[PDB]
Structures are given as C-alpha cells and as structure tokens.
C-alpha cells in the first residue's frame, strides 16, 4: 500500500517552513585566581543579543548552579602573563586587559582602540609572545609590526608594490593563498619567534618573525562576480586549477631590534643562504610552520605536489642571511655562516594513498641536550590509523660550505631516529585535524587527546603517558560525542557535547583524586555553561544503524522514520548524500540545528536515509582511500547497498519513489546516481555540483585523483557533465541548485552542465541563489530552497 | 462551448516535431546591389549588377555579379545567372565606380579587386589581391578615398590610418590610443563608434572621407582630409561581461553608459595628409576646432551623423542634446580647424590666423516635446559660386508628427567672430534663417528614413525617389516626387506586397526585395522606361529575376492580418494564426506573442515564415497565436509611438488585452481561460507586466531576456523614452517589473524565465536581479539559461532546446 503526502499550496509549504524555523560559547580560556578558583573567558551571543567577549567565575566549592555570562564590553589573541586581549571588531583593532596587574574586572570596560597611520585593512593580528608591547599584522600583502604603548609602526616586508595594475603585482608576505586556506586549512603565512635574542654589541632585544613569501605570477587567474550585483563587475582571483601552476613559495625571516624603552632601532629582511627551491626542490606546499618553544629552531611541515611525501624540517636562524642585490655582499654573508648550521629533516611520512595533514607536532625542550630533538607526532601512514608517537631524532651536522652552489642528494639532511614509540594503537583514530589538538602535561608526563577508541560514532577525551605508555583512560561519559577544551593547569576541562536525541550542552568538569596517581584522576561535573534547549514537540530524533556490505565492510547510516508511520504502507524516500572525503555525516550527536529540514521531510511522511559510504572519514586511511583516482564509482555502490538494506530491515521504504539530494560533493553524487542508477533514483536534486574535475583546484583534486594527464580515465568517469547523454530524457527528474557567487564550486560547473544538457537535448529545472556563495547564509534564500524542494518532491515523487 | 485539448507528447516526441519542422520548412537572398552601365554598343548587356550572395553549392557569402540584358522576351521569365567575381565570408564591400575598385574584409585581412573602368569587364573569376600590413591586430572599417582611390582608410587599435593600395605605404594619422596594458588607463579613440552609438543610434563609423582633394601648398602637394569623431571614455562606467571561452572563467571590460550616468566626452576633429605626384605621403596633421567642441556646442550629448557636402566645402554633423528633444544640422568649414599642439603660444597664433567670417552654420533645427528619432535623409544640393545659401532635402518628423520630405533653403549668415578670445555662445548662436521650406510629401503616413531606408535624388530630372507607408502602414512601397514642382507622387511597386528597393545611380533600373504574409520573398529587377520628357511617369517593367519565391510549404498556414478600434477609437492592426484543422464550437488555448516596444512593427504584409516559423508550429498543435501592434509601436507617426513617453509598461498591456478580447469576440475559438504571454527583450518585460497587472487574463508568462529594471539599461535608449531616473522616479518604479515581484503569482508553473548568459544588450543581471527579488518575496519561478548565447540564440541546438522547452511548458501548464 502506497503512502502519499498531502499536496499543499506554495503558501502552505511556506507556512510549514516558516513555522519550523521558529524551533554556543567558544574559544575558551581558563585563568587562575574571593571564593573563585578560576575565571573562564570566551566568546558568545546570549538570548536577545552581535557576538562579544564574555567571562564566567568558577567557585572553589559548588553544591553537592548555571553559570552567569558576564560581559567584558569571532576570535581574539591572549597573553596569559600580562592579561592582554587583542581582537578585531568594527573594522579596526582593539585591546583590553584582564588578570595580571590590576586584578580582575568587576564591571564592563570600554575597549581601547589601536589607531594607526596605515591605509586599508589590518589583517591577521597577533601579539608578540616574548614582549606584549608589540603585535603584528598584514597590510596590502606585507608584514608590519607596531607598539601598543609607544604607537610606533614599522613595515617589515616589501613584496607588494601596490601598483595600479593588480596582475603586475604578484608577491605577498605573511599571506595564506587560496589553496592553502580552502584545501589545507591554513589561514596565516607568518609565525612569531617566542623568544628574544641579544645577538650582541649594544645588547638590544632582537625579535624574529618567520614568514612565507609567495609569487603568484604564473598562476592562472579567474573572475568571480562581486557581491554588489548592481555594479556588474567581478574580482580577479589566482585559482590554481588541477594540473596548473601553484605559487612559487619560500620561507624568510624578518628581524628587528628594540631598546630598553621599546623603540625600534632597526629591521632587516633575511633569506636562506641558498634558494628554497635549491634546498627543497620537491616541495610544492608549506602545510604548516612554527618554532621550538626556546626559539632555537624554526620548523616547517612540507608536502610534495602529489601529497604522498611530507617532511618536518628544522631551520635555524643562522641559516638566514641579509637580503641584498649586491652579489659581493651575498657571498661574504654566505661564507660567514658556520659550517655546522644546516636544515634537519627530523621526520618523514610517506604513503601510496595520500598524506592527510595532521596538526599535531609537539617538540620538547632539549632537557637531554643540543645533540637530539624529542617530539610527539600524529602519524597515520604507519598503521593506516592516526596515532600518537614519541620520536627522537639525532642532530649531527655534516660539514657544509654554503658559499658553494649545492645540489641535495637522496635523503639530504635526514636525521637518524634514535627512538620511535607508539603511545596509541588499534583500529581507531586520534583526531588531529580541523581544530582537534593535544594537551601535554610535562609535570605528569601525560598527553590528553580526542579519538574514536570507544566508537567511530562518538568523539571522546582520553589520556595516556608519554614516558611508559600503557593504559588509556577515557575522561568523557559514553552515549555522547564530545568536543573538549583543557585548562592550561590540567585541573579542569570543558566538554561541548550532544547526542542524536539530546541537544548540546556545555559543562565544566574537575579532575580530582590522589596527585600521586594522576593517570586515574576522576572527572566530576562542576558547573554548566549552557543547558540543552528543549527538543521541539514536532522533532523526532533519527535512528543510527549499521550493516555489513556484500564485501563485508561495516557501514553506518541513519533513518528519519516517516512520522505517524502505519505498518504495511511504503513511504516515498529521500536519500540525503554527501559521500566525499574529510566528512562524516553519521555519528551520535544532535542533528536538529544543521539538518532540521530532514526532520521536516519526515514529518510530511518522507522517509530519509543517510549513508556514510567508503570515502568518508573517522574510519582510517584504507577506508577513505577506496575512492583513490576513481571518485564517483565506489560511493554510489555503497549508497545503493545501504538504501536496499534499509528497505529490507525497516520495511516502510518505497523503492519505486526515491530521490537523491546533496550539496557540493553530494550534488556531484546526486548526478552520478541519476546517471548510473536511473532505475533506483526517480529524481535528483543536485546542489552546487562538481561537474568537471578539470575545473577544481590543485590541493584537493590532485590529492584524491592525481593530475588530469595521469588519470584521464578517472577524471572522465567522475566528471558528470561529460556523461549528460545518460541523464533522463523525461522532464521533472533533475533539479539543479547553485549559488551564483560561489568561489569554491564555481557557477561555471552548473553553467557548463546546462550547456551540455542543451547539446544533448535533455530537460532540466534550475534555481540560482544570486547573492549566495557556496553556503546559503541568508534566511530567505534558505526558506526558498526548502519550499522549492518540498514542492518538487510533492509534485515529482508521484 | 467546449475546450480543445492539445496532444501531450513526450520530450522526445516534441524534439521530433521541432527537428522535423526545421527540415520540412525548406525556405540566401542577394543584397548590397550596385548597377554599372556597360559602355559597349556591340555586346548584348546594358548593365552589370554587383552584389553579395551565397551561391549554389557554397556556404559563405561572396562578391557576385549578374549580366543585365538589353532585351528580354515578353512573357518568358529570365532567371539571371549568379557569376562569381572571386576564385560568413564577405558581409560588406566598398566600391569606387569610376576606377571599378572593390575593397572588403575577408579571412582576417583586407582584399581588393577591379572590374570595369578602363580595365573592362572580366569574363571569368579573378583572384583577390591581399593588402599587406605591418599593423598589429585587425584593420577595421575600411573605406576607399573618393577623391583618389589609390588611398584607403582603416581603424587599427582605435586610431585612424590611411594607406596607398598601389605603393603599399601605410601612415597612422591619430595618436589617441597609447596601447597600454590596462585598457582602463587608455580611454581615448579616434574614428570609432562607441557602444551606445552602435546599439542605440544605428551608427557604425566615426570617420568620413572628404570627397574632394585641395591644393594648398604651391609645391603641388595635394591635400586629402578626413572628418572624424574623437572620444574619451574615462568617466564612463565599466561593467564586466563573461568571455565566450567559458572554460577560461574570465570576463571582458566594457564602457557601459547606464541611464543617468556619464556618456563619453566627444569632439569632431580633422585629419589631413599631403601627397605628391607619385602618391607618397609627404605630411600628416591632426587638426581640431579653433575653440573646444564643448565651448561651441555645450548642449550636445551625441553626434548622430556626419559627412561632407559633395564639393568638400563644408563638413556637416547632426547633433543631439541629452534629452534627445533638440537636434541641429551644423556645417563646419575646414578653415575652422587648426593644427593640434601642446605649445600654447603656437595654438594662439593659429587661432589669430582664423578669419572672422569662418564659423559654424546651424542650417536646420528640429525640436519636439516627444523625442527626436534620427532620420538619415539629408541631401545638400551644390551651391552657385559666391552664393550665401544652401538648399537641401531633409526628412522631418517632428513638424507634423509624421516623417516627410522637405526642400529647405537656409541662409549662411556671418555674424563675424574673434576666435582668439574664449567663446561663450548665446541662444540662437550660428542659427541660419530659413528662406524657404517646401513640403514634398504630407499626410498621416511616413517617409521611411531609418534602419537602412534612404532616398535617391536625380538632379538631371529634379526627382527624388523614396519609400513610404502612403498606400498602407502594412506595406513599404517605392515612390517618386519632384523636388522642383512639388505635387503628384507616383508609386513604382506592386500593391499587395511589402518592398525593399535599391535604385541604380543612373535611375534606369531598380531592384525590389519583396514578400507577403502568404508568399515568401523574391528579388526582381525592374526597368524604368518611357519618354524622357515625362520622367515622373517612367513606367516600371519586370525585367528579370534574381531569386524566385520559394513554394509556401503545405505545412505552413499564413496568419491573417486584421484591424480594430480601441475604446479610445484608435486603429490597431494584429494578426491571427488560426489553430490548424479547426473544428467549430471548440475554444482553443492561446499564445499572445508580444514585442510591444518602440522602433518595431510586428504586423505588416510580409512573409513571417522564416523568422517566426515557430508561431506556425504552435498553431499546428492547436494553439491560436495572436499578435497585436499596440501603441508604442512604429510606422504610425510620432504621436502613436509617443503614447508610452515616460510610462513604459502602462499603456502597452491595456492595448494587448483589448486586442485579445477583440480577437476572441470576432473569431470565437479563443479560450480566454487559457492564454499565455510570450516575448523577448521588450516582449519579456511585457510578458512579466502582463502577469503582474492582468493575472486574471494571463495564466502563464514566458519571459525571454527581460528588462526587469530600467536603471540598469543604457543612456541612448532608456533616456529617450523615459528621461533620466532622477527626473522620473515614478515611471522608473512603475515600469521596472523586478520592483513588483510581490504582485507576481504565488502559485507555481505560471512563470518561465529564459536568458542568454553572454547577452550584452540585456545583461544577465536583469534575470539575476529578478530572481533575487522573487526569492525575497517568496515567489516560485522556472529558469533556463543559454551559457554560450548572446541576446539572439544563434546556435541551432540552443534554439531547438528553447522551442522544445516552450512547447513542453505550454502543454503542461497552460490549463484552467
Ligand atoms: P564541496 O564538497 C566543498 C564545499 S565548500 C568547502 C567547505 C569546506 C572546506 C574545507 C575542507 C578542509 C580543508 C583542509 C572546503 C570547501 O566540494 C569539494 C569538491
Ligand atoms: P530588446 O529588444 C534589445 C534587443 S538587442 C537590440 C536590437 C536592436 C537595436 C537597435 C534599435 C533598438 C530597438 C529595437 C538595439 C538593441 O530591448 C531592451 C530594451
Ligand atoms: Cl536646387
């Protein structure tokens, strides 16, 4: 028996959607301290209320109390010693002080601005760690520093001339370019040295900043529509499409000297004694960089172009020399560099799948001595699972004369590994990406981390010793997925957590127990920062399940059961898909904020299936690697298998009436489904589809698919715009949605698809969101999308 | 009493129908005619007739000729053979009758050939000789020098060049374009018609050869001169339009004067160069008005037209103010231009040397409270020696509100002027008294003077040949009248057809391209014969065919023209495609096809089956197709088209509906519950207006490339009809359909939007902004784009797709 949905009018559907729409603190900082043990600073937006700086006070004892959000006036930089906060707001840079001297505020303060003699925006501000009088920023693609006390400002780099013709001005300093931001999750191009040196002479403080210089001259340009549509203009962007040139890159060191008063006596640009391209010829990208805590060595994390070969490399300051046009000066400087100064490759990761860039690298101070370096490192390529390892490298300098031009041989600068011991292991992951981090207590010799040990459906907080690794203690309660911040003193932590059934809350927990057994400290709930909002009456949590493919692989999925289900009757079904790498849709956390519309579907009597197929993350490199060089192929197989399983198990699925719908990669796969499984999928709604892989960027596309010339078959197979002949020659089976200003998945993708559909004589329906980028931010756009989708389903799913 | 239902077909079904209709049509016309008399009493041919045409077994246009016989058999039809001259393709050519030189662009280059003159006539195809250049990039807008055909002109990188075709010498004359990398830093051109001039003023050149040489310099140097427009687009707004190579994801920068914003800074200037007896270029000189153009002519926004008197005595220009309600025809003598120089001391010397009795002369002035349409007819007669007057023919519309021929005599009045002093003109500065102004034509009908229409004047016989709507607004015909003895107008073309005529320079023969709603076009040559002492009544006789009319397909059923009177008692014409295989007592679904805007007339007695085949296709599937020329449309006088002044949107739909209601009442097979409105451009605008303002009339609208917001359209067009936005906020708001999305239907499947992505007349912005507002007001829409298309859908698969989509949309959603 066939369940049909009530057909409603357009305004009826608007009423439903408008009605549904009626239905968090972050960037936490614990600070030691009356009856208050600590103050917790954070960002938040209360009920009624833009986002602002807030704090809350933790008592020494609490009753065997929901913490009040106190006001202080998207990110902020903080100096624990001085209590200096620095933050952007209202198109300027502001600062305030709390803690340290003058104790703690008991009432809101006015934020003191830092005005300038600078033209245009001041981006990517950071305080100088060694000396909080100073801070840094980028201005017209160059690095500046300034003094908050004196008001002095100094430009350090001279890459960007600021010429009239923008295409004739390719060089930047301190800047993360497009692919680095979008595909490598790095938003800065410079790094404060944490210490001052006193190089000699008058003994003036020298401060140092490592920075990436880039030259985008050879990189391809594209034009994207400006947001102010009425101007009918575009902006130019350097977009390295797969197979094209990435930027020319190079690490440099800026230094400047300061007196006792804090006045800037001098500055200088330094560069590597040989070119970066000479020393590191097979590096395509700088993934990450930083410094050892002592400032003895700068370090960088390098990637080759295929993203199969990563290196952590130390660069000492002595390896940089004054930049100069004078050839005679250059050679003199190169000659003056000690022979025992050199780069040291302290680690190398290699794989035949790909290098996922993990953020975890913790270099220990050289308590041992100057002859070696110990560090913690997240490594995935060893076991195919991301785990913590304690590595020790040997730093013995081979003689080098840097005045000579020099060609690196095989394994140049490679350090012997004295020790390499795995602190974690097993068929589960330490989470080391996209904000996940470790916290290391050198007093107790313990590493805190998050992982999927208990289950891939839940993030939990664990603890292990890095001296003599053994028992792994979990600190978080099962039946929830947890996102944790640790106090700097390792006494308390925050968990933002939820489950599929319970909306999110934010709790502070206390680590209590005998100090002589720190590994087995007990977590005890202390206070709440936010209790869970009430689940709306018209909200029914989805049900997580799992099943085993014909190839004997465990896949997880969800079902939103049709509300007011009756037995016997089969309901029309929406397969909601993403299906691409770096994502996991199915886990035990609350879906009602981001995916409310799926519940709305189910309330009208659509069944909603979600399947995390092979390619999805939190399941190890082998699982995700299944789609290597053949995107589209594996993924659809698993979507079908999961749909068929759910029909068999749950019984209320009408397989004659299935819609496939996703965004981005999900839009791509929606089209693959209709192309390759027309008898499964009656309709497709493809959001912002990738239709041609040749038109996507280097960083992402090449990682997973190689360059086009090396994988013609895979590119062609997985480029849905090339397979338009196989799309249905029946109307009302294909709806395309795309934001016009999208600068990730260019509108080009949809435009070229439509172009090919016209050439193939195929029917299509189309909706554009003229004011939207990739993600639909504006609420009217969202409502319109949702109403369009409900209408489409009610009309064209029988 | 009962409703007809259209057969619902599958998508593939509809594709079969559309693909079939394109083949089964089975419907190439030669053009740009030049008669030349043969100077051989022995041979059998009176003339050779040169033209452009796509011959048999050939896919490109080329230069062709036909031999015109001295005698023809009376009731035998001679079909003339198209001979080739040469061993897409060629779109135009310049021709010098005396020397027999042809000049034309082809294969990304310049070519030339000769036939006639002293050389005599080819009996077989000849190879076209290329003209080599050292110039980078294209050589545009070439023209032969009238005074000396050894020279020709062209534009290269927005500057004026001349060359010698014999010697091969080339010399640049203007130095406006610096050739910088950034185009925004390099905004000046010479010889070039800018966007609004081309698109909205129908002008595609910015330079004009002086027709005569002069001999200043006792060394025996000959001087040759070119009038040209110099422009500066610095202050003009830039917009970006997507490049046609989509895969590059880039745009082109364009200077787009949007209504209200800055048009280019303009000026007329004079380039001269001197030649020796060998034909070498001895010297060149950029000259400019003795005072600035902006000083002399401060109210001039646009140069519509320009040229020279036949003797080269005066350059002339047709000027327009920004409102386009004030036009002046202005004579400019070469002596008013001085050498350009940065040296201010040298400039003053030159200014001091300019005689006091050298000045401009405003020989005609046209003023209206509607708008000035630019008519191309202005013919100055030669002056007697030492005469201070100029006689000329002029087409004037604003006087009676109908475009007619006048013979004007103006008196060239010297006020006497000190050109060293900075100049400020008063009212009526340079204004020339009008001694005489005879009406050669009159009545409630038009002499056609636009969009290719022209006159031909025979100074021997004192006769002026012209085209008009005298007989009917539904047909263009060829007429003749005397400009001496104004009186009887003789018609020269056959009634029951609309005609487009080309006249021989010797007034002995002419060509007519003509057709009717029922008959496809033909091209026939006619001979004007009779006693020479009665030239007004020369008889046109069919002589030969250039192209016979194709057989009207069996599948094709001509529409029927009709007319009616509005409630205000205004006569509107319309046409009706009756549903094929009509059965009585059935009421059929109906498609209102609309354009509705100025400068167009949809309804006239000419063949619609080429351009509007799909309207017949609609009728074959059982839709009635209605077309109404309401008020606003052309060929009915300035008053009729002026109806929509400052209120576009308002009057037009009322007339469309009144006509629809008339057609239902008269014909009886119209189902008023099932009417769709469909149009492109202005028609797209109106399709949306219809749905907004008459939702009870129009069940669905299909809006092609709609104008949705008038603030986003250009100066030339928008301001002519609506003023600038600041002066007409009410009109702009009322007629901008994207500002009335709240009034669009909140029921799906009543609105389909179509737009080419590369359209650079109606920017895609229009559709984007509409969609934006529809989203904001929670309205449903369907959308189709054509990524590779500009305004007109050229590529055939795009067109088929459009047609199939339209049929599907109608068959699915045109119900009650
Ligand atoms: P779609 O799946 C991408 C939608 S836009 C987007 C959103 C987030 C990110 C960050 C990924 C992590 C960086 C290391 C990139 C792009 O298109 C993919 C083909
Ligand atoms: P649409 O009708 C724009 C069509 S593109 C075009 C075609 C012809 C001309 C010359 C004369 C203008 C009246 C047809 C210009 C532009 O209308 C948008 C306003
Ligand atoms: Cl005369």
Residue numbers in the entry:
A (entry chain D): 22 to 44, 52 to 61, 66 to 81, 83 to 97, 101 to 109, 140 to 864
B (entry chain A): 21 to 47, 51 to 110, 137 to 865
Question: What sentences appear in the manuscript?
Answer:
Analogous to Sulphostin, the electron density revealed a covalent modification of the catalytically active serine residue (S730) of DPP9, this time with a corresponding 2-(4-pentylphenylthio)ethylphosphonate moiety, confirming that the (S)-3-aminopiperidine-2-one moiety also here acts as a leaving group. Although an epimeric mixture of (3S, RP) and (3S, SP) diastereomers of 16 was added, the electron density showed that the phosphorus atom is exclusively in an SP configuration after nucleophilic attack by the active site serine, indicating that the active diastereomer has the (3S, RP)-configuration, again matching with the spatial arrangement found in Sulphostin. Specifically, the pentyl tail occupies the S2 pocket, however, it appears highly flexible due to the lack of strong specific interactions with the protein. In an attempt to combine the inhibition features of the aromatic system with the observed improved inhibition of longer alkyl chains, compound 16 was synthesized and showed the strongest inhibition of DPP8 with an IC50 of 14 ± 1 nM and best selectivity over DPP9 ( ~21-fold) and DPP4 ( ~1154-fold) of all tested derivatives.
The dipeptidyl peptidases (DPP) 8 and 9 are serine proteases of the dipeptidyl peptidase 4 activity/structure homologues (DASH) subfamily which cleave post-proline bonds two residues from the N-terminus of a substrate. There, they play important roles in diverse biological processes such as pyroptosis or ubiquitin-mediated proteolysis, turning them into promising targets for chemical probe and anti-inflammatory or anticancer drug discovery.
